[PDB]
Design a binder for these strands. Sequence first.
RNA 1: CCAUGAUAAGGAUUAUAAAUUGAAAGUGUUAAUAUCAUAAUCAAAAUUUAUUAUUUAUAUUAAAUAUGUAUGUGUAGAUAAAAUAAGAA
Lengths: 160, 139, 61, 614, 111, 102, 154, 7, 51, 71, 161
Amino acid sequence: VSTGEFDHPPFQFRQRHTFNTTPLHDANRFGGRTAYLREIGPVNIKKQGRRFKKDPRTVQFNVDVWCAQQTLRKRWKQRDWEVIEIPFRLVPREQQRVIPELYTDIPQMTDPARNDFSNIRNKVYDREELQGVLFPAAGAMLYPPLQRVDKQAMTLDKYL
Amino acid sequence: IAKSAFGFYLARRGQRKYPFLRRPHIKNTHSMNPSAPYFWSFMTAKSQMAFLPEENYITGDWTGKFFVSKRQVYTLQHATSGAKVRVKSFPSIFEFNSPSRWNIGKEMNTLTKPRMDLIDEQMLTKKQRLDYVRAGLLP
Amino acid sequence: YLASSNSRVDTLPVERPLSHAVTFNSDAEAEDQLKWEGFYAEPYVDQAPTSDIDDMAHTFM
Amino acid sequence: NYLSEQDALYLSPTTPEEARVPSALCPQLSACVMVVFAANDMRVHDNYALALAATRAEAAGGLPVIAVTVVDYRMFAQPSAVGGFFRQSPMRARFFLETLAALRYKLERELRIPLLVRCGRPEDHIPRLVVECGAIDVFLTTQYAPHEKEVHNDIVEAINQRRWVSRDPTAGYKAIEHDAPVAHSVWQTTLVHIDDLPVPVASMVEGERWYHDDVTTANIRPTAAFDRCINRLSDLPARGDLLPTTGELSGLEPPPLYRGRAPTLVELGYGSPEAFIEEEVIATQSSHPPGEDAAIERVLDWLMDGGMTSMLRYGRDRRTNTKMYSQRLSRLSPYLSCGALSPRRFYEELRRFTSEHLRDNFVQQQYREALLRLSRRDYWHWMGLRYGPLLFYEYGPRPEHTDDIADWRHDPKIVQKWCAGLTGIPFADAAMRELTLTGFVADEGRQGLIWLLSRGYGQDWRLGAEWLERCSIDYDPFVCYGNCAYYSELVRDDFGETVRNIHWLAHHHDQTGIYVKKWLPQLSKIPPVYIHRPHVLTERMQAMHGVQLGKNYPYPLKLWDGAQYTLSSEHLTTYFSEGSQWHRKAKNGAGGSGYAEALRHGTVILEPHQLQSS
Amino acid sequence: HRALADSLRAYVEFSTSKRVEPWDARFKPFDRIEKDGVYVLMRYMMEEKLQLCNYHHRPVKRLFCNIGLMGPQITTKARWKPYRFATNPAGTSKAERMYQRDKTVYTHGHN
Amino acid sequence: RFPPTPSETPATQDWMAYTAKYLDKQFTISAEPAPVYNVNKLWPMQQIPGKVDQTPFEEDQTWLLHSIPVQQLEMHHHEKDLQDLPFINHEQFPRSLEWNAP
Amino acid sequence: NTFLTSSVATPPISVIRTGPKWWAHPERMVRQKLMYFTLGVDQLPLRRTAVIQRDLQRFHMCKPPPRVGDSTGYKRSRAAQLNTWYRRIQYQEYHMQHLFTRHVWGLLRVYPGNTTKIQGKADDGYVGYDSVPFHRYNRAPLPFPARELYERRK
Amino acid sequence: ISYMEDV
Amino acid sequence: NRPEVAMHRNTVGLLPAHMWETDKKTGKVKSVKDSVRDYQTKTPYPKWVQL
Amino acid sequence: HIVSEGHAMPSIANEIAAFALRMAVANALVKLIPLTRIPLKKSGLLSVDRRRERGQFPGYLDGKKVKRRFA
Amino acid sequence: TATPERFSVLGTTHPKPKRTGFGRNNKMRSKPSDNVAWYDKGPVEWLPRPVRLTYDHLDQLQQWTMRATLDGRTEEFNRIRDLHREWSQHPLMPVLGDVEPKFPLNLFKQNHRAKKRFLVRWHKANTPANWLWMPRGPTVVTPLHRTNPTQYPENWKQMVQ
RNA sequence: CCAUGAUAAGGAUUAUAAAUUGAAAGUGUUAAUAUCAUAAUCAAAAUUUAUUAUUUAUAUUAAAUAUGUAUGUGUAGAUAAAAUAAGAA
Ligand SMILES: Cc1cc2nc3c(=O)[nH]c(=O)nc-3n(C[C@H](O)[C@H](O)[C@H](O)COP(=O)(O)OP(=O)(O)OC[C@H]3O[C@@H](n4cnc5c(N)ncnc54)[C@H](O)[C@@H]3O)c2cc1C
């Protein structure tokens, strides 16, 4: 669910800047990208104006591609991780299996045997645990080990 | 009022709206539209690597063409050879009697003005002359 | 603000405010008071007078 | 200070190189016939002086033709005789400047005749410009108004002997010194030229009816010959070096000093536009754009729409009451006043339209009524010429007819309220609002306003006349002052329209109240019974109709008898006093537009007058 | 042919000539005094290249993108003057300049 | 194809390398610890190895400030061009839209 | 702020007669209430508008009441009086919104649209980067920079 | 009747 | 170069000043001289054509 | 839990969709508890309104409800 | 090709005269229309422009009022509250017979332009300055708002003992 | 040219209800009258003609070739549309 507007408003009478009504291409709809489809000033239909900006189909395609670019940039913002190849033997137990290609089988689970019901296509491993396998010749551990917090420890949250 | 055979056969049906870029009779009245920054990207092939159209070359054992095609793109040889170059246009034809080097690489339809500003004062009727005067096109 | 002479008639006559009865003996009197106060008047604002209709009739004749 | 700077720049004993008319390369084109455009005329389609210059140049003499014009600084921000009104309000000055710009554009782009604009005294500028340009013959139009007849006489006298001026001291110089000119004056202001009237002006019988009789037998010169003479200027050669360039046509750079620059309103001495701007509701949807071509288009569109009903209702031979709210009436008075549209052109166009649409039997009556109106304007011109300076004196031109008129009285508060339009009479309010906001108000509105000021209240008629001069953009001196005197009972002439009461005019012309409702929409709820007398309403009716006297609608200036005893301070609602809205309207605090506005908000004042507070 | 030569000349001269600052001095990023804010960064880091790009809107926006130290602040928060307002010469001080441009030049609104 | 790929730079791969080369020249570590295996920056797309190429832009500004054109002429599909238009839907056979071909 | 185009002003009757579309829209109403609350003044006009408008939209679907027909016209006069009173209350709310919005923009150093007035430091009206080369209401030219209503430093 | 006020 | 990519790379060297006559008072192009008879080139076709 | 069927849109934050959700919840509650039917039916919760947006028609200028220009 | 200075037929083409009017059919004038606002009547120009308020504006206002409260500057708060007190009084109920005028209806030819013109002019005249229905001035009594800044909670030090 | 017929547009009184707000009175092409009739798209084309909703000032020309014109106080006259999932008494 998104609150943004994916649809280009239909062409109708000239829209005047007022309450409830704004110009169709007033630098605010669909971001500032409407300048690509903006033709300012009074224009003679007889011998002025590019028709591709007046074609509803083309402007709908352009706003669709702009929305797709927004979605792609936000997805890549989410994608903080990177993918590294491992030859199937240094991977953890949860990966020593056959993973079907994307959009080819039922969305798999990460070993539901031990009450782990995550998505195998979305699980992300941290660098600390895989530091040894990723840098066999590094010698000294360049990345410090991840200091895990003990849940059984008696801390302030447990009402000391 | 344009006079042609298809005028009687077909009907304009008023100011009907056609699909985008799909009008039946193409009349590129904007071929001669000038644009200095977009000189090489207006009414011309999009890619500079593309070869010249087939209409710029002679294919078979021809005997002679009265006029060359509009899409034929002006080249250096058109001016250097000093031959006869003609392009079909209203009313009859336009002949390149002033060979210039500033139009090399542009299409002849782009060079020729489709909608000529000149208005004939001879074939104009009394009512039509009055209409043109009222519109301001004629004194 | 100018005044007006109470003895001689000035060149510009200005009407004094009208007096209306503070008590009404009859419902007919109350209705007349409302009618002449304009309570029962249409709130429409005149934009074209009957003179236009009369001129149309005269031209038609 | 701007006038002093212009005098130092142009009127110096030696003209600087930055302000020099370029020397003609052709010895035969060195001489050029000159024509000067006055404020009376700003047209080139029927002006007599331009045609005479064209025919003289094509006959012999200097083939080039040079057009000049001078915008005087003495009639824009200077105080009037009394009341300190602008001789031309900011609106009128804007209209005049726009007309001048349109005329200059037409002259320099169609006829290719340069128009040299100067700012300052025409008597100082014109003869020196003629000497500098080496003009053979200088043509102009006859000016016969006060402050204008004298400048015309000074100009012709100076150019007769090739006299000069010298900066501030104005030391006249001789022809010999330098850094056969003859002046021709042609009469073109009136519809019918002098010497064409069936009776001489000196022996003309005093009365508009007799002139209406005369004009039927009078003849009007056709404009085709003059149009041909003007058109010949296109083939006639002219000085091309003075033609405008593309840059100065577009306004990228200021025009060269020798070609001149039109003055700006701020520099002319107005100073505080926010004080003089009026923010009120405008009801009329028709406005007159400056320009002779615009005037011609307006005449053609009015004839096509059929505005003859304004002249006379169809089938009504008797003259009928006008309707000011309507858009049908022809608003050509500003054009006729500014000279953009010639009365001869108006008459010939109207006669052509009538001849075309002669099938209807009433168009002849419409045409004759319009010709009667034009003849009335000409009659007022002749009356102004007959009276001369005697008209502008106190108590009108003819004091013997003003025995019944009481002694004039002067009240700054009363005249300020009348000018602002805070009168209790809705008809007077609407007339004043139209006169102030719009370019002009109708004839009935002018009559009502002037009668209310002069006779209704007792204030001096010159105050109302000068306010009409300030506001009405269709201002003609003789016509305005003569009508003011007639409707103030200063020129008491029989066999003419009777002077009528303000109440009479309101009840007659605007009976239903459409005009009053349109121009004072806050009174829209008032029934047509009480539209013209909102003062006579009880508290109950005021509450039910949503208008409170004083708080919302002002009380009338002239109260009824006994009102002073029964009215308290709260109801009166003084509008002009210390700390009031009118006082704080202007940034400098000197009140606002109205009484002594030229003295209060005038940066440059040539005359001292009297300047005192309250 | 004559008009095409003139239009090419005018377009090249317009492209080479310096234009006005394309950023609005009335909005959040370009509001600080010239001695503070993003103006210090502009004057001490990217001042040299602004003269080389001649203050055209596309190169200045691209340089602001590439310089970093601003992030998305040039689009999410910053605003720029319109297309016909950003093409005025270096010193204009007048609104009506855009209508003073030559009309016989067929440069498609590029002075 | 657009967007065009700008010319590469040596030490723009990571902040460590950028600081080491362009900021101080005294940074001890040359670059971030690179795993011995191959890292696919653009995971869905298999790009030709040894070729300089970009990745989908993280920032919004570059998306609308890049040299990305817009649709001007009619839209052409590699297969849908046989069907003239959405209005002129050319169907060879009156088969079901949910029909399957086993 | 983001809307810098010259705008056309509709009559207050035209604004009010619009139902829960723009004038009575809950999103705009709650935004105005939040602005009033942040300023710390009571929302009496806004609440008086809301209590009328929610009942109006609740009863908009049903038919008008059957009436025998008042000879004196008292019922019609009372209905007109109530309608006018509600309209004037909504007028007061509209004016309050259009005044406090300008005041808040002036306090926050927000440049408004073309041809509008902020009582703080812009009484003539603000015109900047308009399609016409003049104020279009004073017919006076404007400098190439729009204007500087506020100082530079924040 | 939607809103009624004592004053 | 077209405007959409980089106008700043345009330089005066691109313009052939000898092809047209330039006004002195305005910098406009008054006229363009003939460019056919005086034009001499050694490669009307690319050198690899060789007829 | 609510499952959307028919025409799916990103944001359904509109009064029509809210009415549809209300009707679905009321019907589910009636099916779950029988005696709940009386208050909901008397308050009109269960009643369905047959109103729908006018279908497209190219003869109209916008396509829905406005004709074309007449001289 | 050495463009000759003498064009035979190119110049002689009856150049089109400049457009006279504007708008529809190039015949609209430059009259001051009904869109003109009055910047003198009240702090807000009448027929106000459609100003729309955004949540970022609300956040900026919250930050500004936080800064003002933390810095102790209360003159803006006092002036805002006084302005609200002056403009936010309860409208008195109109007396019987108070109704805004309506435009007459005709069936043969309804002029919608005049219909909207009358409404616009009437509302333009109906400025907030002359809104007699809304109580204003110092003579009114407001038993809902604090009359002076002295009794506001920011001056709490005074009310002691 | 003329050479029989035939479909359209054009809302004013049969209503709530378990329901649709588009008509038959006729619109170029179609089936009997004849008596020089080769007028027909397969591209790149020639406004003078009633019956047609165009994008208005942060970012603007890449693929079949596709619009260089008109900034001028939301501005005369004349005129168009809607009471159906919308909000009007
Ligand atoms: C106090 C006063 C001052 C006036 N000042 C002027 C003035 O400065 N300029 C001016 O042209 N008229 C003046 N008049 C005359 C009258 O006001 C105008 O003729 C008319 O009202 C202008 O509006 P119109 O063009 O729509 O009238 P129309 O009747 O449509 O115009 C017809 C033309 O006839 C002439 N005309 C008609 N009636 C008169 C008249 N009574 N007196 C003189 N000429 C007339 C004018 O040239 C006018 O333009 C004045 C009248 C009065 C009572």
